[PDB]
Design a protein around this nucleic acid. Structure first.
Ligand SMILES: [Mg+2]
Ligand SMILES: [Zn+2]
Lengths: 1341, 556, 51
RNA sequence: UCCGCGGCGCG
DNA sequence: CTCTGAATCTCTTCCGACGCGCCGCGAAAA
């Protein structure tokens, strides 16, 4: 079954793959995060309570005073989002925190408290999230783009051999904590191991090992493997493990237990190892030469004198062996090392480190991390311990701990947030293994090592920083102040935390302006995932390795939406079905497979888990219970493509729409065009401009409904029912009988945004789209927004397009457009700019706005009102005055003779100058609104009273309708009670409402109910009274303007823009284009039926772009309108409903085993009439992205509509009249209009203002500045010669004031002679160098 | 100054005030004869303050303001892209400039560009004032500004008068080569977009994708003479990098020429003998004979003698009537044999170069203009267009893919049996897939290139096919073999970003539906190419700047 | 200010051919240093020259 | 109003 | 066994297109 709104216009589908999981709410990634950031939580793993538990309690370091936290509460915001934006302030809520201060007795224990104080401290403001997922911070609308930062943890990466010669690879291990200093271990080409901190100077590694309570020998025991030697009768014996001889050449004999056998000069083959194993050889005897060159493992001390000989790491020799034998050590311990395994690297590091004990290593690290200051025992110890092994400065967050434990294959999934010594030893071990070859590096950009950090986490971190600031503040307060004559609000200070929050939400790089061109822009901006910002990486250093699409991006980041330009790859997008894991990794859904049969259960998998399994994708075909059709099924095993049996698959792709994001999923026929142009088209859809009228796309992808619904552009009825009142401004709905809250009015009201400025200066308007008495279900769209039709996204318009090189007008991607579309206004748009004028307290009187203005013509004044503000509805041109403001000049004293001369000349010598606001040059339009604001206590003029008065009557009529509804409900209850007993319903209806309230029902329980209803009437009366009076207070009150400003005025200028030659015009699939010709309607080609073609595209784009989607769409569109025409004609023929029901039923039934299966037999005749009314010129088609319409079905649709099957029809030239020799593709294309308006970019400067610093002309159209003749053009002129032109450029047209003045006089006089002169910029340079303390001067003067 | 009497402080002022504070404090401190520790600390503080004043940030942490910005010093104002040298001394912003979006002007000649009327008015306002004073209509410059603002009808006439021969320099940002700035003699058009002659769009490296470009006007007589002599597009038709001509017809014009010269074995009016190209024009414009008809016509050609005299000759020869139409616009010195071929971009380039090397510059300019017009005209009359049915899929494809499927399957089994190694199997799988790709590409080209036709006697014949895509690619007008191969045949065996071939072929074509995994594999190369192309520009510009600054001194 | 970084005595007048104290306001006073205030009367261009 | 810095897109 | 020179290592410096367009916002200084 279908809903009423969908029943209005059902979009026919073609999808063959059955759908399982409905598209989730698109805005989750924002809303869920802020929910985690703002709601109460006792456990409080993450959030504001987590911050408070992480800072409070705070105790005086050696006092008997403590400050402990209880709870936090968020107050109701002063204004709603509409009030906030019209006022132009931050939509914030207060943080109310319950706080307790405790003071103990002096006697032990410390818990012997003696006094407590408790209260709720105000703790600044937090910007609150709006239901549509946006912030309102300064009246403006702002959004946060989530950051894809590198996950905290441990990474093992190689340089691949670029740094050193011979391609020798140098390995690095790096530890990234969630906050605090880093830690890197590196291998030098000399195979020595080094450590470094925060990319400071390199150090020997073991010093950090020595930094802890780890002497040399114990470190050796941890790191290496041991070998035992014994000397008896000048004979050397040692123990053996067969695996040790793997890889060693048999240079000497091997003998044991009277048995000698070895392949002298050869390698120890595995046969030798197995022979030794089966022989179970424990010890062998070796010559002196073998032990020569070996390295000892431990220190050895003789008791003959008390001396230490051959300390550990020292390499054995004949003298050492003689000394140890004569001293008496019969047991020798050494370490074992091979070139293939168990490298000697730690031994070399111990041979190279200058340090010898814990103190010396600590001294070294102090000397390394802070040059220029003296070492010192206590300070060095303190900074080391607080830097690494304390939560004060270091914390590997829980996700960091998880990643760490996973990397070093531990079992525990949770642990401490602070590093431990054994962890460092484990990292050393793993790095040594990697260098040995028994391990693998990890890809730095593997998406399992990137983490999506959302709004809540960033705000939490900033708030934590502010909290530690206020923590030191209160610490020193409690430390200094007396304990029993204060109260926490005295100790606290809201300014630091509020400043931190405001700075993060306003100025941070990841809080950019929220662009509001069209709802698709809304969705794609909120779902954008960036790698820039703090802790990320910068644009100018991002190599190609980060930017490339990794194979793990499947179903997690769309390859298509990513922007072109220097930001490519760094700004990804989130796929439709993906969602964020608890740890912040990316999840995607999958369907479990069993016994070669897929099933409807859904799993969510992260990247790393996905790596293990083997999964097949949606291109695979399923039947019956979902059993695989093909024997060998293609899958995505372990990050690579292959095929397997049915029995080997693990999970199946959730749907065909998995890989694509919203923006690219809106493109039809995506699987037919090259990725470059598909990417450009998906990106360029986002720049569509809402037209005055909207029309549905004939060829859609089925996502438009969902995208419009989730996007906040449209009004959605929160409760179903039947519509009670419809108006262009407001809509009133009556809820159902089963939907009302027990004891509720049952009526809901929405106010529609009529005409307001967008964030990008475009137009935001809403249109009611329901009829009177129309049933409404929940979730139904009740007010179409911009670029929306009946709840369907409609960016552009449908136009009749033909492909042919009609003349030179299509030379490179140049579109030639019929005047017919200009006359129909199919592409007109509306733009709204804003202007402001500010009043500030100037000396000798502040600036004043007034009707009177000197040196201005009478007509201009007549445009202004008596207050000095233009009347609403007055057209204005460029340079006209809008707000008449004057400013005192100051003293401006003049001599009596000069004053008399000024009086003789006229009304001159006045101390007041003009400061009125004018239209920007080239701007024109009509005025739609004037907003005024004024500091409290300053008088409000008649005009401001006027706007406030309209506001108050609007509020009063809203609340009056509210009270009439509530009176209707309450008196309906009164009448029902009367009917239930003591019925006087006829008299009650006849009598006025006072008689309804006054009736006493003989003191029954029904009379008690009547009294309760009278009390309800009373309380609602006072409630409405107080709310209305509060509204009067907030309207009448002053404004919190900027300091020094008494009052401001803002005027809104609206203009209507049309298609103009040179304007840009979009077609999805990356078919860019500039409009290059508007032709009279009689010149364009036409078909045999006389219908002209609106747009003539250049065919030459298609073969080189491989945008073969667009041609397909064109053909498909040709079928769609065809059906429409018949339906249209069949409505004009006014024939029977049943036969048209038959026709439309056939049209829907044409799909070959499509899923929709609509049955019109269930539609009442009114429904069919309405559908046909919408279906006139329509027949929309939905083609899923990779489950789209096969060409055969499009041919069948074409033949149903009686169009020629080939899709190419004959045309006639408008001016010549004979047929074009070959048939020409004619069809229907969805074309968009882009924000790059040609009349905005066109600009011409000539003469104007000059920059004060260097006398050069300004830059920028807004300030009427000239173009820039950059160095490229300088060389261009240099090559041609043309030296005179270059000199003219530099000396007159740019810099030399004297020369350019003389030249201007010459040109006015008609003489065109050059007058060269020294550029003033060079003089500037001369002076600047002369400031450096350098003599520079001209020579031979 | 700022609103309300407030001020914004130039960075130098803060550093100077710091130095003044420290110096005055040190002076008053020395006056009081305090112990050496205080004066030494104060004087070292003054030293660091003046260090910041001169070259803030060179040593230690730069002093910063309340905006946590590193304050600019005197030294920082000279060094860098934003410094005085690069930003100001070179590349001074100029008056009398405008910028606008471009639009194809087909009706233009080679050297005149279309200019929006409003831009012309603004740019030439000094000249409008001058001529208005000359004719005495405006008694004062105030009056001139009035009438020029009042757009009195005389003002437009004066504007046409002044621009009669005054060329304008026209640049497209960014200039990459000396052909990036050219001068045109303007004409006035309505609207707000600069009309450009189609030919020079190749030289400017413009693509008419909403790209903007700027206009300047010379002022001195000298500069106007340099413009007309040196920078005029009619000159400098040969690039300085290499002698190859830069004005080369491409895209629509090439398509029109190729479609015009092509022959068809059977056509209306074929076989008839016609006196001359004039009557060929009569025949075709009367619709009595198709463009591709092969006929016998009389032609005449001329050649320079030892003295350069154009000795004439004439005869009857076979010709397609379209090529006969072409012979009208040829200059008087060209030999006929050049036109007698299936014209393509390479051929047309050789043709224009030929007439440049044989005849003077004016014949070549006129010939280029006329070939431009005629190419557009007959391409228009052609109606050549692309349809969904054009990318015909060869029936052999299913067979070839079947064979390759078997070959890979058996090879995989052989690898599973231990007969071959993973790398060896990888290599031979790549080899067999490449062979399959070659087979299918060859078969598809063979099917596309030729069509079956009927002769005068009804007998089966074969000719070069008239399928739209084939003629688009063959002519060289915005296409090549690779793209048409990808249109309907195999897409190939491209590689992962690491360069390894994925060993799983991209099977379907774009007319067919690329499967999800297939397309997602296909996107890796696209992303890599786009990123590389975007990032290369920085290094290319830098390398150019260094090279220019090394070679700027030389002059013959 | 009297002796600041913009001192009229040092870097010249604040307006073309106008003394700081307004004693002289005619072009005939060119090159005259006002006795009352001590500021040379000349073009404001010297504010770009004098260091 | 003309100043400076950061972010975003276009070519 | 010691001294000097030569060579490497360690640190510091410089610098990665350009033209716009758009947007917003400065202050313990007055
Ligand atoms: Mg371009
Ligand atoms: Zn004076």
């Amino acid at each position: 079954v279908y809903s009423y709104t969908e029943k209005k216009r059902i979009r026919k589908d073609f999808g063959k793959r059955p759908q399982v999981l409905d598209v989730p709410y698109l805005l989750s990634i924002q809303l869920d995060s802020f929910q985690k950031f703002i709601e109460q939580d006792p456990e409080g793993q993450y959030g504001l309570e987590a911050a408070f538990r992480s800072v409070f309690p705070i105790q005086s370091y050696s006092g008997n005073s403590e400050l402990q936290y209880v709870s936090y509460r968020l107050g109701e915001p002063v204004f709603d989002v509409q009030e906030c934006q019209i006022r132009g302030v931050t939509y914030s809520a207060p943080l109310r925190v319950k706080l307790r201060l405790v003071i103990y007795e002096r006697e032990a224990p410390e818990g012997t408290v003696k006094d407590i104080k408790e209260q709720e401290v105000y703790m600044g403001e937090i910007p609150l999230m709006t239901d549509n997922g946006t912030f309102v911070i300064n009246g403006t609308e702002r959004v946060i783009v989530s950051q894809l930062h590198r996950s905290p943890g441990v990474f093992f990466d190689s340089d691949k051999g670029k740094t050193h010669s011979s391609g020798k690879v140098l390995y690095n291990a790096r530890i990234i904590p969630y906050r605090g200093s880093w830690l890197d271990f590196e291998f030098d080409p000399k195979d020595n191991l080094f450590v470094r901190i925060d990319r400071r100077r390199k150090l020997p590694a073991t010093i950090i090992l020595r930094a802890l309570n780890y002497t040399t020998e114990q470190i050796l025991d941890l790191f290496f493997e041991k070998v035992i030697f014994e000397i008896r009768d000048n004979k050397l014996q040692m123990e053996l493990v067969p695996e040790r001889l793997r890889g060693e050449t048999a240079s000497f004999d091997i003998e044991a237990n009277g048995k000698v056998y070895v392949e002298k000069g050869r390698r120890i083959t595995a046969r030798h190892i197995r022979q030794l194993e089966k022989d179970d050889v424990k010890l062998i005897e070796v010559p002196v030469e073998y032990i020569a060159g070996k390295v000892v493992a431990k220190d050895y001390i003789d008791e003959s004198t008390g001396e230490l000989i051959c300390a550990a790491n020292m390499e054995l020799s004949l003298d050492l062996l003689a000394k140890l034998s004569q001293s008496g050590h019969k047991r020798i311990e050494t370490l074992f090392t091979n070139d293939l395994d168990h490298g000697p690297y730690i031994s070399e590091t111990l041979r190279v480190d200058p340090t010898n004990d814990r103190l010396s290593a600590l001294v070294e690290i102090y000397r390394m991390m802070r040059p220029g200051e003296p070492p010192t025992r206590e300070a060095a110890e303190s900074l080391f311990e607080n830097l690494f092994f304390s939560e004060d400065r270091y914390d590997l967050s829980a996700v960091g701990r998880m990643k760490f434990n996973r990397s070093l294959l531990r079992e525990e999934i949770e642990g401490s947030g602070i590093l431990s010594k054994d962890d460092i030893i484990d990292v050393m071990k793993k790095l040594i293994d990697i260098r040995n070859g028994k391990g693998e590096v990890d890809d730095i950009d593997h998406l399992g090592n990137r983490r999506i950090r959302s709004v809540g986490e960033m705000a939490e971190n900033q708030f934590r920083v502010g909290l530690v600031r206020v923590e030191r503040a209160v610490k020193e307060r409690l430390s200094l102040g007396d304990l029993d004559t204060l109260m926490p609000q005295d100790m606290i200070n809201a300014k630091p935390i509020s400043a931190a929050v405001k700075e993060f939400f306003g100025s941070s790089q990841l809080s950019q302006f929220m662009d509001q061109n069209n709802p698709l822009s809304e969705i794609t901006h909120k779902r954008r995932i960036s790698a820039l910002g703090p802790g990320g990486l910068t644009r100018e250093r991002a190599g190609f390795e980060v930017r490339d699409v990794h194979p793990t991006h499947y179903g997690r980041v769309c390859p298509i939406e990513t922007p072109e330009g220097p930001n490519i790859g760094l700004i990804n997008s989130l796929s439709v079905y993906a969602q964020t894991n608890e740890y912040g990794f990316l999840e995607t859904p999958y369907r479990k497979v069993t016994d070669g049969v897929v099933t409807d259960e859904i799993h969510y998998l992260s990247a790393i888990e996905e790596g293990n399994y083997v999964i097949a994708q949606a291109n695979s075909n399923l039947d019956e219970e979902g059993h695989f059709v093909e024997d060998l099924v293609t899958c995505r095993s372990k990050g690579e493509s292959s095929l397997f049996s049915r029995d080997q698959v693990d999970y199946m792709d959730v749907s065909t729409q998995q890989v694509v994001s919203v923006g690219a999923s809106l493109i039809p026929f995506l699987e037919h065009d090259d990725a470059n142009r598909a990417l450009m088209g998906a990106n360029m859809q986002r720049q569509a401009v809402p037209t005055l009228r909207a029309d549905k796309p004939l060829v859609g992808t089925g996502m438009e409904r969902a995208v419009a619904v989730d996007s906040g552009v449209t009004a959605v009825a929160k409760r179903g029912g039947v519509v009670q009142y419809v108006d262009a401004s407001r809509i009133v709905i009556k809820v159902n009988e089963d939907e009302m809250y027990p004891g509720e009015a049952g009526i809901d009201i929405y106010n529609l945004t009529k005409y307001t400025r967008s964030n990008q200066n475009t137009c935001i308007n809403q249109m009611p789209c329901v009829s009177l008495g129309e049933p409404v279900e929940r979730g139904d769209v009740l007010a179409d927004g911009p670029s929306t039709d009946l709840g369907e996204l409609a960016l552009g318009q449908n136009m009749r397009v033909a492909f042919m090189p009609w003349n030179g007008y299509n030379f490179e991607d140049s579109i030639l457009v019929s005047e017919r579309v200009v006359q129909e206004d199919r592409f007109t748009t509306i733009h709204i700019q804003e202007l402001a004028c500010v009043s500030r307290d100037t000396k000798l009187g502040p600036e004043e706005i007034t009707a009177d203005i000197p040196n201005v013509g009478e007509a201009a004044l007549s445009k202004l009102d008596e207050s000095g503000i233009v009347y609403i509805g007055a057209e204005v041109t460029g340079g006209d005055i809008l707000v008449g403001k004057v400013t005192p000049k100051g003293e401006t004293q003049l001599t009596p003779e000069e004053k008399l001369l000024r009086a003789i000349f006229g009304e001159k010598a006045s101390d007041v100058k003009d400061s009125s606001l004018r239209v920007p040059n080239g701007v024109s339009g009509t005025v739609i609104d004037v907003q005024v604001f004024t500091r409290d206590g300053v008088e409000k003029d008649k005009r401001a009273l006027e706007i406030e008065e309209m506001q108050l009557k609007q509020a009063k009529k809203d609340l009056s309708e509210e009270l009439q509804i509530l009176e209707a409900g309450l008196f309906s209850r009164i009448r029902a009670v009367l009917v239930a007993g003591g019925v006087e319903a006829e008299k009650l209806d006849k009598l006025p409402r006072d008689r309804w309230l006054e009736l006493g029902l003989t003191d029954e329980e029904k009379q008690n109910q009547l009294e309760q209803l009278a009390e309800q009437y009373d309380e609602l009366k006072h409630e409405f009274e107080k709310k209305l009076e509060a509204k009067r207070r907030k309207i009448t009150q002053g404004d919190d303007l900027a300091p020094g400003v008494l009052k401001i005025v803002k005027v809104y200028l609206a203009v209507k823009r049309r298609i103009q030659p040179g304007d840009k015009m979009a077609g999805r699939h990356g078919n860019k284009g500039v409009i290059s010709k508007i032709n009279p309607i009689e010149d364009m080609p036409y078909d045999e039926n006389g219908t002209p073609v609106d747009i003539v595209l250049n065919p030459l784009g298609v073969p080189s772009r491989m945008n073969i989607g667009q041609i397909l769409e064109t053909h498909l569109g040709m079928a769609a309108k065809g059906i429409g025409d018949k339906i249209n004609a069949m409505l004009k023929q006014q024939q029977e409903v049943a036969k048209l029901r038959e026709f439309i039923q056939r049209a829907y039934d044409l799909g070959a085993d499509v899923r929709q299966k609509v049955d019109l037999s269930t539609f009442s005749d009114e429904e069919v009439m309405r559908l046909a009314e919408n279906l006139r010129k329509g027949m929309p088609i939905a083609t899923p992205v990779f489950d789209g319409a096969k060409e055969a079905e499009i041919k069948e649709l074409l033949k149903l509509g009686d169009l020629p099957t080939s899709g190419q029809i004959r045309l006639y030239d408008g001016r010549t009249g004979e047929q074009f020799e070959r048939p020409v593709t004619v069809g229907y294309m969805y074309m968009l209009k882009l924000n790059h308006l040609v009349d905005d970019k066109m600009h011409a400067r000539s003469t104007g203002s000059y920059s004060l610093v260097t006398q050069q002309p300004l830059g920028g159209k807004a300030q009427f500045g000239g173009q820039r003749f950059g160095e490229m053009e300088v060389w261009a002129l240099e090559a041609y010669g043309a030296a005179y032109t270059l000199q003219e450029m530099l000396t007159v047209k740019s810099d030399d004031v004297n020369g350019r003045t003389k030249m201007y006089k010459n040109i006015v006089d008609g003489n065109h002679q050059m007058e060269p002169g020294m550029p003033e910029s060079f003089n500037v340079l001369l002076k600047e160098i002369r400031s450096l303390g350098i003599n520079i001067e001209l020579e031979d003067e | 100054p700022l609103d309300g009497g407030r001020f914004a402080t130039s960075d130098l002022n803060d550093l100077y005030r710091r130095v003044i504070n420290r110096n005055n404090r040190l002076k008053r401190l020395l006056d009081l004869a305090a112990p050496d520790i205080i004066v030494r600390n104060e004087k070292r503080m003054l030293q660091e303050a003046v260090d910041a004043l001169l070259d803030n940030g060179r040593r230690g942490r730069a002093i910063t303001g309340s905006n946590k910005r590193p304050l600019k010093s005197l030294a920082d104002m000279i060094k860098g892209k934003q410094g005085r040298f690069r930003q100001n001394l070179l590349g001074k912003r100029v008056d009398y400039s405008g910028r606008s979006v471009i639009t194809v002007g087909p009706y233009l000649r080679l050297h005149q560009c279309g200019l929006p009327k409003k831009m012309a008015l603004e740019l030439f306002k000094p000249f409008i004032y001058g001529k208005l004073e000359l004719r005495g209509l405006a008694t004062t410059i105030k009056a001139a500004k009035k009438m020029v603002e009042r757009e009195e009808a005389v003002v437009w006439d004066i504007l046409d008068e002044v621009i009669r021969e005054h060329p304008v320099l026209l640049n497209r940002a960014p200039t990459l080569h000396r052909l990036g700035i050219q001068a045109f003699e303007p004409v006035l058009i309505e609207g707000k977009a600069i009309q450009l002659h189609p030919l020079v769009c190749a030289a400017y490296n413009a693509d008419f994708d909403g790209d903007q470009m700027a206009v300047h006007v010379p002022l001195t007589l000298e500069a106007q003479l340099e413009a007309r002599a040196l920078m005029m597009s009619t000159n400098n038709i040969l690039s300085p990098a290499n002698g190859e001509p830069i004005i080369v017809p491409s895209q629509d014009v090439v398509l029109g020429l190729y479609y015009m010269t092509r022959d068809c074995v059977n056509a209306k009016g074929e076989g008839m003998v016609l006196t001359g190209p004039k009557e060929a024009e009569r025949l075709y414009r009367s619709g009595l004979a198709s463009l591709h008809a092969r006929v016998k016509v009389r032609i005449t050609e001329y050649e320079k003698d030892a003295n350069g005299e154009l000795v004439a000759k004439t005869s009857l020869k076979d010709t397609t009537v379209g090529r006969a139409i072409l012979w009208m616009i040829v200059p008087k010195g060209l030999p006929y044999s050049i036109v007698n071929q299936a014209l393509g971009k390479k051929a047309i380039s050789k043709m224009l170069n030929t007439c440049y090397r044989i005849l003077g510059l004016k014949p070549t300019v006129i010939f280029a203009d006329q070939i431009m017009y005629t190419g557009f005209a007959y391409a228009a009359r052609s109606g050549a267009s692309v349809g969904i049915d054009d990318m015909v899929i060869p029936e052999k494809k299913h067979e070839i893919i079947s064979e390759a499927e078997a070959e890979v399957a058996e090879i995989q089994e052989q690898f599973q049996s231990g007969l071959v190694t993973a790398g060896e199997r990888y290599n031979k799988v790549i080899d067999i897939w490449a062979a399959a790709n070659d087979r299918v590409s060859k078969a598809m080209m063979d099917n596309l290139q030729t069509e079956t036709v009927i002769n005068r006697d009804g007998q089966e014949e074969k000719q070069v096919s008239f399928n739209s895509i084939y003629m688009m690619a063959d002519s060289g007008a915005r296409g090549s073999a690779a793209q048409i191969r990808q249109l309907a045949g195999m897409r190939g065996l491209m590689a992962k970003p690491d360069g390894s071939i994925i060993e799983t072929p991209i099977t379907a074509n774009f007319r067919e539906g690329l499967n999800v995994l297939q397309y997602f594999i296909s996107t890796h190369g696209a992303r890599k190419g786009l990123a590389d192309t975007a990032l290369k520009t920085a290094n290319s510009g830098y390398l150019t700047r260094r090279l220019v600054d090394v070679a700027q001194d030389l002059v013959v | 200010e009297r002796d600041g970084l913009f001192c009229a005595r040092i870097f010249g007048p604040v307006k073309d051919y106008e003394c700081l104290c307004g004693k002289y306001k005619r072009l005939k006073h060119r090159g005259v240093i006002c006795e009352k205030c001590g500021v040379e009367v000349t073009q404001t261009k010297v504010r770009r020259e004098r260091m």
